[PDB]
């Protein structure tokens, strides 16, 4: 709180972020000399952490905000993971109190960046990255319906969401396996008792969800509450049967997807 009320620190953070953007986009103005790269490396990290914190106190970001542009450039460039997660948190915190109709920072998110974040959704071996992407998308489509339209305008984002969300519902919760049954063969028990064949093996059911599944459920519930005859509501209808399969396999999913099943 004391740091935010200081123009010098914020100006320094912005300066370092613009230098990082110049490194990321590959500008010919300022080219880092690799003999110094080490220093720069450490520098960048600290700056981003600072940004993350103060990102909560500049919450409504306007249209031509330099922080947002710098962060999206760095996000499209970097290969670090700590950096990607920090940038996603910082971006999701710069969209807290923003209107959909009013011109805001969310108009600086071209289809490339949204496609990149949904691609992050497409991964499987990183729960934290998936949760960060889902939190960002939740905060994105939260204030209104025009942002849902802008999100589903892109064909790639639409396809990836449609293929990913139902499978994210059953993410790491050990569904009942119907393959032991197909592999189990039926014979006669060797051996005065009458001849039984054998007992079909049992089938267990999961009793609790994972964090990724809970976040996906909340996202679907939020997405279902949009006005019909508009995108986002047609998405749920295109997605329903796979969700029905998932619900048949997981009861806590039926308890958790109540708002989704109400508005469908």
């Amino acid at each position: 709180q004391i740091l935010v009320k200081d123009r010098e620190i914020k100006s320094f953070i912005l300066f370092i972020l613009k230098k990082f953007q110049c490194v990321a986009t590959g500008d010919n103005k300022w080219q880092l000399y690799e003999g110094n790269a080490t220093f720069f490396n450490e520098l960048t990290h600290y700056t981003l952490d600072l940004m993350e914190a103060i990102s909560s106190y500049i919450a409504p970001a306007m249209k031509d905000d330099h922080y947002f542009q710098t962060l999206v450039s760095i996000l499209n460039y970097t290969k670090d993971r700590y950096m990607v997660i920090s940038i996603l948190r910082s971006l999701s915190r710069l969209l807290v109190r923003s209107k959909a109709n009013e011109e805001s920072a969310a108009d600086n998110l071209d289809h490339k960046t949204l496609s990149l974040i949904v691609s992050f959704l497409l991964l499987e071996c990183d729960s934290e990255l998936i949760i960060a992407s889902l939190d960002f998308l939740y905060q994105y489509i939260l204030p209104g319906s025009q942002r849902i339209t802008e999100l589903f305008k892109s064909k790639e984002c639409s396809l990836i969401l449609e293929a990913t969300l139902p499978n994210l519902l059953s993410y790491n919760i050990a569904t009942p396996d119907y393959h032991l049954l197909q592999k189990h063969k039926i014979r006669l028990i060797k051996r005065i008792t009458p001849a039984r064949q054998n007992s079909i093996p049992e089938v267990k059911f999961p009793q609790e969800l994972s964090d990724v599944s809970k976040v996906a459920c909340t996202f679907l519930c939020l997405l279902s509450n949009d006005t019909d005859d508009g995108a986002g509501s047609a998405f749920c209808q295109r997605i329903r049967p796979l969700v029905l399969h998932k619900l048949a396999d997981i009861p806590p999913l039926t308890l958790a997807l109540s708002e989704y099943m109400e508005n469908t």
């Binding site: 993350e52 909560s56 106190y57 919450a59 807290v96 204030p143």
Partner: peptide, 26 residues
């Protein structure tokens, strides 16, 4: 070590979500 969920961030998130839910109730 970073604090993943600050107090003010959580408070603002809850407040905004409650406000939007109340708007939808209207």
């Amino acid at each position: 070590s970073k604090v993943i969920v600050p107090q003010t961030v959580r408070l603002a998130e809850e407040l905004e979500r409650q406000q939007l839910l109340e708007k939808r109730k209207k």
